[PDB]
Design a protein around this ligand. Structure first.
Ligand SMILES: CC(C)[C@H](Nc1ncnc2[nH]c(-c3cnn(C)c3C#N)cc12)c1ccc2c(n1)OCCO2
Length: 168
């Protein structure tokens, strides 16, 4: 369906909204929802824990079966798995955790995965406890992604800061 509403249009293909990605997935029923994943697909906190709990742990069980047979992802990589009751597919993307010393250069690689999908509902990669500068993450998104991306940022102060910084 991909019926997104209430988003600010930043560029011809990048949109942003102050919202919880889980509530947006429930409302929109998107073709693809992006998970802010880690390499072993352990969906404990942040975006990942919220998406997993909304699937009543079906996402974690599926992720564990994937890791058992294929091993961990690489930083900057991704994996398409089921979207369960939230979306047709979930694109698990691993952005660098610069609070754990991972290279910020891999954030462009992480966003490049979005280009395989015409339209996506996504979080701001490597933000929050992953510790990348969120303004930098938004700029990398705008410069790298060519497909339609709807960013849901669940923090009004951060949303307002990103919008002000971009409108400069
Ligand atoms: C920068 C943050 C505002 C952003 N978080 C979010 N962005 C968008 N929709 C979100 N829903 C929730 C949510 C719903 N219920 N609960 C209990 C939570 C939690 N926690 C968080 C969330 C962000 C984005 C990238 C992340 C990350 N966090 O954490 C590390 C890895 O990469």
């Amino acid at each position: 369906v991909n019926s997104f509403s209430g988003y600010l249009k930043l560029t011809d293909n990048v949109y942003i909204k102050n919202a919880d990605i889980v509530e947006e997935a429930k409302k929109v029923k998107p073709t693809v929802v992006v998970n802010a994943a880690n390499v072993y697909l352990k969906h404990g906190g942040g975006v990942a824990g919220a998406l997993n709990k909304a699937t009543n742990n079906a996402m974690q069980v599926e992720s564990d079966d994937y890791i058992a047979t294929n091993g961990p992802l690489k930083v900057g990589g991704s994996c398409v798995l089921s979207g369960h009751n939230l979306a047709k597919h979930c694109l698990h993307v691993v952005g660098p955790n610069v609070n754990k010393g991972e290279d910020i250069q891999l954030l462009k690689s992480a966003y490049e995965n979005f280009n395989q999908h015409e339209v996506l509902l996504a979080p701001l990669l490597s933000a929050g406890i992953f510790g990348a500068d969120p303004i930098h993450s938004l700029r990398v998104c705008v410069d790298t992604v060519r497909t339609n991306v709807y960013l849901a940022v669940f923090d009004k102060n951060l949303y307002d800061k990103l919008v002000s910084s971009f409108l400069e």
